[PDB]
Amino acid sequence: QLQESGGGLVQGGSLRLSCAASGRTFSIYGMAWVRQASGKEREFVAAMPRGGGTTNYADSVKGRFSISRDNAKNTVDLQMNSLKPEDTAVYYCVADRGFTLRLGIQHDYWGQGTQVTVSS
Amino acid sequence: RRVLKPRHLNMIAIGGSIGTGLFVASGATVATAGPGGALLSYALIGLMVYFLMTSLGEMAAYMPVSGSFCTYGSRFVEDGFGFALGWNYWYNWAVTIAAELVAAQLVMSFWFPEVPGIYWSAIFLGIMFGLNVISARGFGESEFWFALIKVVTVVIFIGVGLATIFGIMHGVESPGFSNFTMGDAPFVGGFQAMVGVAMIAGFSFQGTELIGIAAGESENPRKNIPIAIRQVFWRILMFYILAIFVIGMLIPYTDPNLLKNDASDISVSPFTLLFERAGFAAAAGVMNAVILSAILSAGNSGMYASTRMLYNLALEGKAPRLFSRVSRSGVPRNALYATTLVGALCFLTSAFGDSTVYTWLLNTSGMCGFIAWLGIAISHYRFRKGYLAQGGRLEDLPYRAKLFPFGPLFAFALCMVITLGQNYQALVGERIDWIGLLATYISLPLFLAIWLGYRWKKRARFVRYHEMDVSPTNT
Ligand SMILES: N[C@@H](CCCC[NH3+])C(=O)O
């Protein structure tokens, strides 16, 4: 249903990660990206509708990440800048169905996810 | 037999007035001009349609004829004007049939997206041709039942939307006034988008002006006109406003599943989308099947009406005599063949896409309807001016208008500016060419050519004010 790509090892620069969806997806409202560390509570990161009229971030990561969409591959892209070792975690690309942009760390559809680690 | 209750007549009128504009074109209008612009455009179109229908009802009440507004246009302005109006009406019905076929092909998707829709359109056209050539006895009952089903599903949609907007059922949040204000203002685009969606808004309200003609059959129109006017006008306006408001508020304008020139994926009707995104599975399929059946019935009814009106036109000396020949059962054959040949235009989707062809057909139908509205408004204005010049008493008229000449003038100006501002940017730039002008404006050159040819071949001029038919005829 959902696929994520673009992960790897970053020394602390900038990196873009892409998420794509399978067929159907005509009963969905908007997607989101949520991180979690090794043996740590899930923490919301970003959220955005597919069409894209607004974006929602987290307080600790405001002004550093940029979530948008690309029509070349029709995929949701997230650009992370000024990456730091404290952000080493696994990201899940999720999405919600309804009439309103649902927030929180609870979602219906889940993907494989991508693990990102930062080395000194 | 006037055994039908007034409520039955009102619901029949409501079912007849409702077309494909609310089912499919509403999403495109919302995506293009936003909720507020669509609401304003629909309100203006409704007011214009109300004025035009009131004037037509007054015309029918004063002098009833069996030749509809074409006879009025012929006998009050010029014979060629009425001839061109009739041919434009026939072409409008043909374009409407083509648009119905295209819409059926388009809504046929979302169930089998891995097969071209050309085969489905061909099968539907063949089935319609077979039904038309076999018999047309069950037309009235089928039309009445389909109108009842359409009214029922419209009121069900209104009720479920009103239940959802406030929020009573569990498992779904209340969007509130969030989808309205998001990025761009509800009034998105500008003058260009407004006049662009004005064509669709006018197309949606077309077809409901003939009710006044029915009101011309009343023995005492004095009391029958206001009741029907009030009921039909209020019901249509309330239903349209509520449906468009619900669609605009519950669906964001930047939805990829809406009809546009560039579509990321397939597009579905807002009525189906509301149930599909509500988490209630196995319920959108029934509504989609109902929509498909309604589209098929509307297309069959339109084809039958176009064939019958073509035969009636061929009965007189206007059309060439090689159309009134009938078979042993009396069903015309040449008219049906011509209608099928003209409606075969819907096969260009395999070479030019789906959205563009549907938009072009909608634009052509709206332009033809606007030409007809301009003609009928001019005929009504000339008739009233001639009657005033004749000195006839105003109390003798069974019906009248409230504000004159505010009615005909305002509608004429609005229609003219809407028609003219569709593609004004072509002449502004250095590129002029002819592709855009031919693609956008095609009914006007044909109408002008037909009128000029008739005037040249008949040598006819305008009708004098003091030399016109004034005394009504009793049938
Ligand atoms: N409003 C009707 C008729 C449109 C064409 C009128 N000439 C419909 O959408 O079905």
Q: What is the resolution of this structure in A?
A: 3.7
Q: What residue ranges define each of the domains in chain A, with the CATH number in brackets?
A: 2-100+107-114 (2.60.40.10)
Rounded alpha-carbon distances, angstroms, from residue B146 to B153, B258, B391:
10, 26, 48
Angle at B454 between CA B451 and CA B455, to 5 degrees: 85
Angle at B339 between CA B333 and CA B340, to 5 degrees: 90
Contact A49 B252 (CB under 8 A): yes
Residue minimizing CA distance to atom 10 of ligand 1: B19
Task: Determine which of B166, B179, B258, B262 to mutate to test the interface with A (most A C-beta atoms within 10 Å).
Answer: B179
Residue minimizing CA distance to atom 8 of ligand 1: B19
Amino acid at B372: A
Residues 28-87 of A with CB under 8 A from B: 28-29, 49-54, 71, 74
Rounded alpha-carbon distances, angstroms, from residue B314 to B78, B90, B424:
20, 12, 38
Contact B264 A71 (CB under 8 A): yes
User: Which candidate from B175, B182, B266 shows the least CB-CB separation from A99?
Assistant: B175
Whole-angstrom distance, CA of residue B246 vs CA of residue B259: 18
Q: What is the CATH number of domain B6-425+435-458?
A: 1.20.1740.10
Q: Tokens for B126?
A: 């063949």
H-helix or E-strand spanning residue A67:
strand A65-70
User: Which candidate from B257, B264, B277 shows the least CB-CB separation from A99?
Assistant: B277
Angle at A43 between CA A41 and CA A48, to 5 degrees: 155
Whole-angstrom distance, CA of residue B92 vs CA of residue B375: 14
For tokens 């000029």, what's the residue? Answer: B452
- Asked if B46 and B243 count as a contact pair (C-beta separation under 8 A), the reply is no
What secondary structure does DSSP assign to B59-122, as a single string?
HHHHS--SSHHHHHHHHHT-HHHHHHHHHHHHHHHHHHHHHHHHHHHHHT-SS-TTS-THHHHH
Task: List CB contacts (< 8 A) between A100 and chain B.
Answer: 173-175, 178
What are the E-state strand segments in B104-206?
none
Experimental method: cryo-EM
Whole-angstrom distance, CA of residue B422 vs CA of residue B440: 8
Task: Parse chain B into domains and list their residue ranges.
Answer: 6-425+435-458
User: Looking at residue B189, what DSSP letter applies?
Assistant: S
